Amino acid sequence: VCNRLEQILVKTQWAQSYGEAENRAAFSRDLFSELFNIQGSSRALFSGVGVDDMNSAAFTAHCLRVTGALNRLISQLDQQATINADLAHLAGQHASRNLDASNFAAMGQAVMSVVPTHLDCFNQHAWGECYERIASGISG
Amino acid sequence: VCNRLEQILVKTQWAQSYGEAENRAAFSRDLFSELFNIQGSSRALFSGVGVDDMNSAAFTAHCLRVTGALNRLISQLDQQATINADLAHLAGQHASRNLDASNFAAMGQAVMSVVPTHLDCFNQHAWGECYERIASGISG
Amino acid sequence: VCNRLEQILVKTQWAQSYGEAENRAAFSRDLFSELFNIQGSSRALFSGVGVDDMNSAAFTAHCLRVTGALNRLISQLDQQATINADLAHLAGQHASRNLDASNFAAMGQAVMSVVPTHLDCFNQHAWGECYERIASGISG
Amino acid sequence: VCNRLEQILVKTQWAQSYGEAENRAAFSRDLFSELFNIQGSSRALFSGVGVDDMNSAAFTAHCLRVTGALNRLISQLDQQATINADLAHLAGQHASRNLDASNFAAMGQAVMSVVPTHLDCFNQHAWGECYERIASGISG
Amino acid sequence: ECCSRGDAEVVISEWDQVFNAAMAGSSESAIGVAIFDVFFTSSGVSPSMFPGGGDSSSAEFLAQVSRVISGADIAINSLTNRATCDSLLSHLNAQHKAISGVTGAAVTHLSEAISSVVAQVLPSAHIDAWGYCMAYIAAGIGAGL
Amino acid sequence: ECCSRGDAEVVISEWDQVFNAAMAGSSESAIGVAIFDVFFTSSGVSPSMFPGGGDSSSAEFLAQVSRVISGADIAINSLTNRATCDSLLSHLNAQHKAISGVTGAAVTHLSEAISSVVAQVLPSAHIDAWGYCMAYIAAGIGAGL
Amino acid sequence: SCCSSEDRANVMHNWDAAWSAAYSDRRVALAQAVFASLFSRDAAAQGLFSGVSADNPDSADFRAHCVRVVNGLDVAINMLNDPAVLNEQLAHLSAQHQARAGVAAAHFDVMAEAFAEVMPQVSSCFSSDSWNRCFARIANGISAGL
Amino acid sequence: SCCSSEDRANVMHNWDAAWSAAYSDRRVALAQAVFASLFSRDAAAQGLFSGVSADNPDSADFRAHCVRVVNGLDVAINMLNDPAVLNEQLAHLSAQHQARAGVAAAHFDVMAEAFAEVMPQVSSCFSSDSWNRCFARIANGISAGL
Amino acid sequence: SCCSSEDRANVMHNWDAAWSAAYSDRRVALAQAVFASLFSRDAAAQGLFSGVSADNPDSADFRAHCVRVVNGLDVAINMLNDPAVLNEQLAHLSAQHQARAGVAAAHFDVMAEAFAEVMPQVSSCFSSDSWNRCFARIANGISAGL
Amino acid sequence: DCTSLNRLLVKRQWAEAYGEGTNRELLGNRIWEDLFANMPDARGLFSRVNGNDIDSSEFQAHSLRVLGGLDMCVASLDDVPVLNALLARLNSQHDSRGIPAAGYPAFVASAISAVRATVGARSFDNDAWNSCMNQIVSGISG
Amino acid sequence: DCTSLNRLLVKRQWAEAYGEGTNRELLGNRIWEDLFANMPDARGLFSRVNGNDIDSSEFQAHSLRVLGGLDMCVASLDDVPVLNALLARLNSQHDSRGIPAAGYPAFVASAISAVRATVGARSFDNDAWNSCMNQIVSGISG
Numbered sequence A, B, C, D: 001v002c003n004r005l006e007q008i009l010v011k012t013q014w015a016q017s018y019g020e021a022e023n024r025a026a027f028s029r030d031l032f033s034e035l036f037n038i039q040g041s042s043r044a045l046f047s048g049v050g051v052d053d054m055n056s057a058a059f060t061a062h063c064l065r066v067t068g069a070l071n072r073l074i075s076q077l078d079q080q081a082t083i084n085a086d087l088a089h090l091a092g093q094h095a096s097r098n099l100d101a102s103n104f105a106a107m108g109q110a111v112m113s114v115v116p117t118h119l120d121c122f123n124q125h126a127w128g129e130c131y132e133r134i135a136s137g138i139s140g
Numbered sequence E, F: 001e002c003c004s005r006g007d008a009e010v011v012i013s014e015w016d017q018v019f020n021a022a023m024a025g026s027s028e029s030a031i032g033v034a035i036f037d038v039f040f041t042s043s044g045v046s047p048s049m050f051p052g053g054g055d056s057s058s059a060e061f062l063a064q065v066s067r068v069i070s071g072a073d074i075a076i077n078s079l080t081n082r083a084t085c086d087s088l089l090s091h092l093n094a095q096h097k098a099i100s101g102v103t104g105a106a107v108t109h110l111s112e113a114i115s116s117v118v119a120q121v122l123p124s125a126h127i128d129a130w131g132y133c134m135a136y137i138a139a140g141i142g143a144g145l
Numbered sequence G, H, I: 001s002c003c004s005s006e007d008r009a010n011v012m013h014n015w016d017a018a019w020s021a022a023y024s025d026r027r028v029a030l031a032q033a034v035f036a037s038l039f040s041r042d043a044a045a046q047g048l049f050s051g052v053s054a055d056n057p058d059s060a061d062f063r064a065h066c067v068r069v070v071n072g073l074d075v076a077i078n079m080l081n082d083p084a085v086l087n088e089q090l091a092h093l094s095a096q097h098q099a100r101a102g103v104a105a106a107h108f109d110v111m112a113e114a115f116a117e118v119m120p121q122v123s124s125c126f127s128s129d130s131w132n133r134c135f136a137r138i139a140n141g142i143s144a145g146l
Numbered sequence J, K: 001d002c003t004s005l006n007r008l009l010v011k012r013q014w015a016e017a018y019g020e021g022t023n024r025e026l027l028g029n030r031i032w033e034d035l036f037a038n039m040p041d042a043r044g045l046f047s048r049v050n051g052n053d054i055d056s057s058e059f060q061a062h063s064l065r066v067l068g069g070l071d072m073c074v075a076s077l078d079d080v081p082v083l084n085a086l087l088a089r090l091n092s093q094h095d096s097r098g099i100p101a102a103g104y105p106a107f108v109a110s111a112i113s114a115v116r117a118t119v120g121a122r123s124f125d126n127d128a129w130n131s132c133m134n135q136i137v138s139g140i141s142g
């Protein structure tokens, strides 16, 4: 799942879609807006980070921490041992948060929703495999 | 799979992404370009419609017939009995073409690739269910 | 000093020069920047309102309170009894602040410096008389 | 009155405000328009140079001779002996023209009116001192 | 946010259309007096609390009205810079802590009197944006009161 | 201000030129390792404080380096929104209050190691803007430490 | 919370894009889903709608009730750019609901959830955050009094 | 002299900016100053205005006369972009002034001076040269006949 | 087929975006995948590369061979905007391959398939149609003679 | 008449003329101004919603309730079973209010004129608009 | 009524609709066209200023004299002592001219409709305009 060729394509399209500076913050809020639109039960899981107002500094900061983690994982997609160690670290953090498979499946569909709307080119096959690679490492 | 609410969203995003006039032809060629990029073995299946030159009138015409069929199916997504009859008609046409499940899965991923690159908003959850609804009716 | 005709001209040019919204804040900082450039000894008089950083919220707020007072005085230039009462109120506030005549003369020259740079038309004769009218009421 | 530092500032702001080519002519007419607006009794003093039509070649030529003299005086502000000799020459020319102090005070206020409307930055303190320096030399 | 940039911009535009230095002093006094009339009735606050005792014919009270509406004007025109506006409201808040009788409810009443009179002289006013922004101004002025 | 919008914009631009997801993981690790080398020498902090013990051949330490530089990346790219960036730094600050051995001086050393390595890989870097912005980031992360 | 100028511009545009009379076979599907969600979250609330055949959701009677209720929201949503008129309308709606035995303020909280559940599934672009604040601005006006 | 297209565009704009009905407590101050200057330059002319209480300038009677006269100028000034209508109006004003014993053409020369004195003090931007030519175009139309 | 102006502009841009020396750990992955596909489609062709340790693909020897071959394509691809120079280079490459016992023209057909398989997986934007025509323009120049 | 094609045309043009936000008030003003000019006794029927001042907030809310009900019926023209139920409820809000029968053809004429004025008169299908508006009001009146 | 707030509103909207230059003729045409359509016998009152041809130079000058007088009264609404004197003089120019009392409410209606048409109907304060226009004409009529 997610071979060396697909990693380059996903790293290329992620960096272009995720962008820089405030565009990352708008991207990150849109990602969680799509998550909540796809799985409404997921919104309450973020009550500890100001989800009541999604434009708040607190919730924007959480959205950036999440996409920043996605950003650092995609950056190390081509260093298998490094990302495996990092994904294990993330799995240990998420183990206590009462998440299930549908939560990560909804997140995946949210990623597949927002990323291509900032792109002229998008390969959903490569993204499906490489997202599965990342999320499977975090889901335990 | 693909409820009345999701049908409206998919019909809305399809009509906006598919566009009008020559934009449909560019869209349709891009769709099959992504299909071939995702599953190279699929390209030879279209040797009868000038796939050797994807800008040719013959291959553009085939791409439009396919997306035009997708267009007419999405248009009738909210009339269950009508689209069921049409999907059965399409299934009978595709039964002899030596297609497998991976062919339609690659097509789905191609659709999920090209449609959102012509959109500001894209709900991949609704599209996943509604594409599955359509393709399952054609795959037999 | 400052007759009914001059009052209309000064009220007209002030409202146009002072502007609205953030333009008032830029105007107000420029006014005190010119004051400090003209009389350097005046800067220390404002140590209680963050004059160490003239772009700070605290010093911008003081600059607006001052120009806002100028704004409310010019607004009542044509109601002699009202502005006389207000100027007396301001004089009582400034009596304890260890100010001298040169402080108000420098302020006047600062006003004559910044106001016309936001105007196509400026009558310094009318402004000289009407500023003297206002400042004389505050200086005691 | 008008120290070496103020001379540089006034020379800088004058050259920028006075401009070049026809902008000098528009500037010079505006200066005397403000003079007449401030002291109506001054207009008749210029009956010998076509003041009946302020856009006439004759009155524009007089306005340029006056601002050109101001221009040459400001140019020599930093050469004390040169400008003193020139101001004495101008004083001898103006001695017979039945002018009083209010005429030069109105001219000063006109200068303080038109110069800053062609500037982003204007230091009326420096201009007050340096204009007083010039006019005092001409008034006798 | 409450009083967003869009809300603030329309409030500022409508307020300065109704209230600016180019208008006659009598016109601005007539608006401030009307604002104080509404405030007196909605709040129950004694007019004798103010210099001039609420008499619209007293120059002392008209100057007091001018000072209060000017403070609101300065805060309104600063609504697009929250940091500056917070500082202005904090100063006003401290000034009113030192006044016996100024409650948070009364401050709200006066800020609401501002919005209601504005919509009387400018019936096309964005009264929702006015409520949200004057409530922000009122909350800052009446903090702890 | 310290780390103005102009400072932040050039820092962000230069950082993302040097550090982004399109680059090889080995290249980003080489930069993070170099940053940690400088930090270790300037701060005196024990490498055993970190998972992998500072060994650049240990996947545990390279992943730890990736996490730390990512936190800096997230804060850097938020430098134009002070409210969001303050929230990010406050979260990081609370996380490091719960770590025995994290001092305010060490946090400064690591933020300075970031600036110095950036100017090594990008010699045209605006090192003043980098110092001002990384000092803002360091002050927030090391508040009370 | 505050329904800001930006909030109501976004909400009005995305609402009208789904609810416009120019389209067919959307209003009933949407409005039926709203009340289906309402009854799913507050099964007791269905008893309030016995005069409109709530136990037969595909009846013309109940479909028309759903469309009537949700078009009431359409009328109020499009008044968001004239709040002086909106206040009159919400007062009008409040007085009608006050005269309906059993209608409580907490019911509107359940109705908010139903719209919050249905709208993301149907509206191409949807900002739940802007929707929540502007629905509250309307629903609080109706539910005042009860 | 000729009141050119540029002259009347400048004059109409700067006049209306001061005289507009949107403002308060300007018209009386301006109009009072005009007649105060008129009486200052031609003290005999005050006798023509005995029916409007000229010896009590702050009376409502005299203030209304001043406003009435100067608004007559406002009406004529704003006709400068339709001179066919202006000619009818000046003829109308001429016939009214011809029926007023004592009103001479030289009086309008003194009135020009009064406006030439008052307007620079009150109008932010003021071009006396354009004003002189366009006031003459109007005043000569009124003063024709007397 | 013809590698048109539009074809080579598209190909050169998308090639250089993946192959640029500014990136790390892409060239080897790409070049290794190309020869892995070549050997997958023509297992006999691996015998031609016995001097570069083809039976040990992760050796520095074979990795450098792959990079050397594919960078040869990079040099030729970027000559597509100076075809007079490209013709000299293809002749140069042809003479080198003519001196290699066993290298046949049909081998380049298998190499085309390998690039046609690898490039869509690695290049964000990829037009196989433009790539096919411009690879043929280069490969036919090399394979001429054999 | 009011055929299935007619209903699509009326739906499209109504949504265009009705519009969004305050454009709805623009259409309402066209209707009530025309209606009250042609039938001045109709204004008194609206004394409880301040029909003497159509620009008031009270009447505008009433106007937008009416246009809202018309929009609701227009949108359901291709859904006749639901339309019949919507009209039946609207009838209950108008019966025994003393509304003259003449008010409904007058309202139809004023609504058609206002939509025609908003979307443009060229090629305007008066037969489709009259017949479909007549299906709506004949369910409400009497 | 016509409160102090009403007078500020009417002053602002009047100056906007009245405007500058030839825009004043645009407002006048709206008034006289409406007045003569609603009250055709009013045209004959203006036979000396060529009321049969409102586009003539003679009537336009008359129209701008009237609107000029209304502007003059509007601008003095917050100056009641001066207003009363202005109205008294205007009364002397209308008395025993045989002007029917009905002409003044008709003129008020036409002026309000024309201002409303120029500045826009949404949120237009008819109570403020009617009451303040009624103070003006009640000083002129009779």
Ligand code: HEM
Pocket (backbone or CB within 6 Å): A042, A045, A046, A047, A048, A049, A065, A066, A069, A070, A090, A094, A097, A099, A103, A104, A107, A134, A135, A138
């Ligand atoms: C798929 C890739 C994901 C990544 C890279 C990721 C990463 C992160 C990161 C970096 C944090 C910050 C922890 C901290 O600094 O305190 C976090 C917190 C959190 N994440 Fe995830 N996450 C992912 C998926 C998910 C999903 C699918 C859900 C739920 C549907 C989820 C729910 C949470 C929650 C509830 C928190 C804690 C919020 C709080 O502090 O109250 N995560 N995640």
Ligand code: HEM
Pocket (backbone or CB within 6 Å): B042, B045, B046, B047, B048, B049, B065, B066, B069, B070, B090, B094, B097, B099, B103, B104, B107, B134, B135, B138
């Ligand atoms: C998923 C939705 C699909 C739709 C709506 C669709 C529809 C159509 C239509 C309308 C035609 C035209 C037949 C004619 O007019 O002669 C066609 C032909 C064809 N389609 Fe599909 N199709 C779909 C999926 C696929 C997939 C996934 C494949 C293969 C991977 C495929 C392969 C073909 C082939 C080989 C032909 C005939 C080409 C020829 O004439 O040589 N289709 N299809």
Ligand code: HEM
Pocket (backbone or CB within 6 Å): C042, C045, C046, C047, C048, C049, C065, C066, C069, C070, C090, C094, C097, C099, C103, C104, C107, C134, C135, C138
């Ligand atoms: C000429 C017109 C002036 C006006 C309208 C004016 C008005 C004001 C106002 C409204 C305040 C706010 C008081 C408060 O809210 O606490 C203030 C404060 C102050 N003003 Fe003035 N002022 C004028 C001239 C000056 C001048 C010429 C100086 C000194 C050169 C000066 C020095 C100060 C100081 C020191 C304060 C208090 C700062 C502090 O709180 O530490 N003012 N003035």
Ligand code: HEM
Pocket (backbone or CB within 6 Å): D042, D045, D046, D047, D048, D049, D065, D066, D069, D070, D090, D094, D097, D099, D103, D104, D107, D134, D135, D138
């Ligand atoms: C303040 C700086 C002034 C400068 C530099 C200046 C300079 C000049 C110059 C160069 C001339 C040209 C003489 C010639 O070539 O024949 C002139 C003429 C004249 N200036 Fe001045 N002047 C100044 C102030 C004034 C003022 C304040 C007044 C009156 C209010 C005035 C009134 C005149 C008059 C009446 C003439 C002669 C016009 C004629 O020929 O009929 N000047 N001046």
Ligand code: HEM
Pocket (backbone or CB within 6 Å): E045, E049, E050, E051, E067, E068, E069, E070, E071, E072, E092, E095, E096, E099, E101, E102, E103, E106, E107, E108, E110, E111, E138, E141
């Ligand atoms: C939006 C609401 C308000 C604003 C913007 C405001 C602002 C102001 C300002 C600018 C001043 C004058 C400061 C100075 O003298 O330099 C003032 C004074 C005063 N305020 Fe307020 N105020 C508000 C509400 C209230 C309320 C609700 C009360 C009473 C319940 C109140 C009581 C007073 C009094 C009595 C003074 C006179 C203080 C003195 O004469 O020294 N204010 N206010």
Ligand code: HEM
Pocket (backbone or CB within 6 Å): F045, F049, F050, F051, F067, F068, F069, F070, F071, F072, F092, F095, F096, F099, F101, F102, F103, F106, F107, F108, F110, F111, F138, F141
């Ligand atoms: C600019 C400076 C710094 C930044 C941006 C930063 C950020 C971070 C981040 C993002 C993490 C990982 C959070 C997670 O596991 O989810 C982390 C962990 C850690 N940090 Fe920092 N840090 C900084 C400075 C320092 C310093 C100076 C020290 C020691 C003196 C330190 C000690 C640690 C340790 C030991 C961990 C591992 C915690 C664990 O494994 O659970 N950090 N830091």
Ligand code: HEM
Pocket (backbone or CB within 6 Å): G045, G048, G049, G050, G051, G052, G065, G068, G069, G070, G071, G072, G073, G076, G093, G096, G097, G100, G103, G104, G107, G108, G111, G138, G139, G142
């Ligand atoms: C934004 C939220 C709501 C809006 C805009 C709204 C609006 C409406 C409208 C337009 C009607 C039409 C009936 C008529 O006026 O003759 C209606 C009826 C009714 N509504 Fe509401 N409503 C809302 C929420 C609720 C809720 C939460 C409840 C109770 C849980 C409720 C209970 C009822 C009932 C019982 C009726 C009468 C049904 C009948 O005709 O028998 N409404 N409402």
Ligand code: HEM
Pocket (backbone or CB within 6 Å): H045, H048, H049, H050, H051, H052, H065, H068, H069, H070, H071, H072, H073, H076, H093, H096, H097, H100, H103, H104, H107, H108, H111, H138, H139, H142
């Ligand atoms: C541009 C210049 C002038 C204009 C536009 C003008 C216009 C007017 C107007 C509108 C009236 C109103 C009275 C009415 O029509 O019933 C009036 C009255 C009068 N004007 Fe003029 N006028 C001008 C100059 C003069 C001058 C220079 C004089 C004499 C020095 C004069 C003498 C009078 C007199 C005596 C009255 C009658 C006062 C009364 O009602 O008892 N006017 N004029």
Ligand code: HEM
Pocket (backbone or CB within 6 Å): I045, I048, I049, I050, I051, I052, I065, I068, I069, I070, I071, I072, I073, I076, I093, I096, I097, I100, I103, I104, I107, I108, I111, I138, I139, I142
């Ligand atoms: C576009 C297609 C090709 C290009 C640009 C290319 C280019 C190159 C280059 C640059 C070298 C470097 C060796 C040197 O010059 O010293 C090389 C060597 C070689 N190539 Fe090609 N080549 C291509 C296709 C092929 C194919 C299809 C084959 C055979 C199936 C082949 C067989 C060889 C062999 C056997 C060597 C020598 C290996 C060795 O050094 O022992 N080439 N080629």
Ligand code: HEM
Pocket (backbone or CB within 6 Å): J042, J045, J046, J048, J049, J062, J065, J066, J067, J068, J069, J070, J073, J090, J093, J094, J097, J099, J100, J103, J104, J107, J136, J137, J140
């Ligand atoms: C298609 C045509 C019409 C529709 C859709 C319609 C719909 C409505 C609606 C929805 C209301 C709001 C009732 C409420 O909730 O309080 C209403 C009120 C009313 N309508 Fe109609 N209506 C139409 C035609 C007419 C006509 C032609 C007249 C009279 C000539 C009329 C007279 C009234 C009256 C008197 C009210 C009540 C006003 C009040 O609240 O006091 N309607 N209408």
Ligand code: HEM
Pocket (backbone or CB within 6 Å): K042, K045, K046, K048, K049, K062, K065, K066, K067, K068, K069, K070, K073, K090, K093, K094, K097, K099, K100, K103, K104, K107, K136, K137, K140
């Ligand atoms: C606010 C309302 C009105 C104002 C301010 C006003 C003002 C005026 C003014 C200034 C004149 C110019 C007189 C002159 O200098 O020759 C005039 C003329 C006249 N007006 Fe009025 N007027 C008003 C209403 C009316 C109405 C309602 C009528 C009739 C229905 C009317 C009938 C006339 C007539 C007959 C003349 C004389 C026409 C002529 O020159 O032969 N006016 N009015």
